[PDB]
Amino acid sequence: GLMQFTLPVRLCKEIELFHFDIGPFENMWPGIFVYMVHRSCGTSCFELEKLCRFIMSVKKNYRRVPYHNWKHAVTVAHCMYAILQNNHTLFTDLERKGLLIACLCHDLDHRGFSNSYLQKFDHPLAALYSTSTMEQHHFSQTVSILQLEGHNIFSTLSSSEYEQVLEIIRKAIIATDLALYFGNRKQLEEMYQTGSLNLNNQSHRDRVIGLMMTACDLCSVTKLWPVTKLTANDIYAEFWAEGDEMKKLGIQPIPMMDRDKKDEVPQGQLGFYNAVAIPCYTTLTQILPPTEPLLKACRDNLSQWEKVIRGEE
Numbered sequence: 237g238l239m240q241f242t243l244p245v246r247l248c249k250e251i252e253l254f255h256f257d258i259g260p261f262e263n264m265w266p267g268i269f270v271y272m273v274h275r276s277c278g279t280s281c282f283e284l285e286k287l288c289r290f291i292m293s294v295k296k297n298y299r300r301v302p303y304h305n306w307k308h309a310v311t312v313a314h315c316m317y318a319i320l321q322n323n324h325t326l327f328t329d330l331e332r333k334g335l336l337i338a339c340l341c342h343d344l345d346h347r348g349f350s351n352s353y354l355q356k357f358d359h360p361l362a363a364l365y366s367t368s369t370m371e372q373h374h375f376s377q378t379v380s381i382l383q384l385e386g387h388n389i390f391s392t393l394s395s396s397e398y399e400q401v402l403e404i405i406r407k408a409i410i411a412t413d414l415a416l417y418f419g420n421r422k423q424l425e426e427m428y429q430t431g432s433l434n435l436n437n438q439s440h441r442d443r444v445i446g447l448m449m450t451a452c453d454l455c456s457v458t459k460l461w462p463v464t465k466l467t468a469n470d471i472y473a474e475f476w477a478e479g480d481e482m483k484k485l486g487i488q489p490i491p492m493m494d495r496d497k498k499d500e501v502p503q504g505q506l507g508f509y510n511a512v513a514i515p516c517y518t519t520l521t522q523i524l525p526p527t528e529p530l531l532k533a534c535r536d537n538l539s540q541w542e543k544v545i546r547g548e549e
């Protein structure tokens with residue numbers, strides 16, 4: 237009840253900034269997460285015993301893969317923390333509760349392979365979930381863990397609030413499927429520009445929460461250059477492993493996953509920044525002005541990749 241989490245001074249200050257890096261000390265990440273829930277939600281949102289038991293079950297169910305791991309879960313939860321703290325009065329009690337949990341759980345039991353690789357492999361999960369294959373699986377794992385004895389961190393919510401929060405989490409996790417991002421942003425762009433965007437329209441909030449989820453999920457591109465560059469290695473480590481597995485299935489992978497075409501990474505990063513990242517943080521900044529630092533950091537990292545191509549680094 238009267239038990240606050242406190243971080244050292246440097247972390248206490250830097251955790252409030254969008255570009256914060258959670259550091260290489262795994263044993264501090266749970267405390268960092270709880271700190272962010274207490275400041276974002278309140279010391280009352282969750283029974284600390286239940287929350288702590290939930291956090292460690294979620295950690296156990298992330299795998300030791302190069303990128304889609306426990307560090308990513310906490311990194312994406314921190315970007316959401318930053319968006320929520322800079323947009324205080326725009327989000328309901330339940331939304332602040334739901335979205336931090338959604339972010340922590342959004343890649344549960346990820347194996348480092350795309351939906352396309354599961355489909356080409358003919359993985360059982362591809363037969364169970366025809367679209368957003370891993371994302372339906374990640375939500376499934378969230379419900380499973382929530383149903384372990386002593387793990388239901390929402391037990392103090394009413395029946396209807398409980399259904400609302402699980403629906404917030406489900407939509408939030410499905411939205412992290414980048415195949416759904418393109419259409420969601422295009423619709424949000426049209427709505428903002430024609431002036432029809434209405435945050436009291438539930439289907440509109442849905443879309444805006446989806447875009448926040450894309451923004452948090454891609455937040456590696458919003459870090460300081462050395463963090464962005466070193467995360468890109470983890471990202472390509474999985475892509476090239478998947479490429480290797482495509483070749484084993486007798487399929488030439490797209491160049492992005494072919495470790496023979498490493499040379500082409502700088503240009504591929506440019507395309508991703510231009511086709512995905514910049515559009516994402518631009519629309520987010522239009523709808524939520526205080527998220528501008530994400531757009532600014534993203535632009536700075538585009539410039540850094542342009543410099544890599546020009547042989548200036």
Ligand SMILES: Cc1oc(-c2ccccc2)nc1CCNC(=O)Nc1ccnn1-c1ccccc1
Binds near residue numbers: 456493
């Ligand atoms: C589109 C393209 O083409 C090439 C390419 C490279 C080398 C050679 C030829 C092409 N590279 C890219 C972009 C690489 N994607 C990237 O960085 N994604 C990213 C950033 C932050 N989070 N995520 C992320 C998103 C979803 C799943 C996993 C990670």
Ligand SMILES: [Mg+2]
Binds near residue numbers: 342343412413
């Ligand atoms: Mg994912």
Ligand SMILES: [Zn+2]
Binds near residue numbers: 308342343412453
């Ligand atoms: Zn993710």
